[PDB]
Design a protein around this nucleic acid. Structure first.
Length: 71
DNA sequence: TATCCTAACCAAAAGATGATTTGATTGAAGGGCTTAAAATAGGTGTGACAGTAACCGCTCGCTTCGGCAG
């Protein structure tokens, strides 16, 4: 279930640890790197942009702290 | 589409990696000692010497100045 990555590393059998396995998976996890879009992400992105943006300047990536699976 | 992620790459903050320059240290030498001795030749100031110097709780005895005396 993408959980207990110590067990995942042990099952891998190449002497990897949980942290390395998780790092590699997250760097190649479609669920994390959101090529997709969701309604709540769009709504909250619009809300934060409208709250903060002045003129043509918006906090393009500082919104990522609030919305998951982004950069 | 409006917008984004962030694979691989461009612009900028910050975060870091080694070579070079400047602030700082010091190793060795100029130097200028030491007592230890032995010595002739010396000059006087000064510091003892010494002196005067000066400055710094109860109960008797004794006395006087008037108020009548002479």
């Amino acid at each position: 279930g993408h959980l207990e990555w110590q067990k995942i590393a042990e099952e891998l059998g190449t002497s990897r640890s949980a942290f390395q396995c998780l790092q590699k998976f997250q760097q190649h996890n479609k669920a994390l790197k959101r090529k997709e879009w969701t309604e709540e992400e769009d709504r909250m992105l619009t809300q934060l942009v409208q709250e903060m943006r002045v003129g043509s300047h918006i906090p393009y990536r500082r919104i990522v702290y609030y919305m998951e699976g982004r950069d």
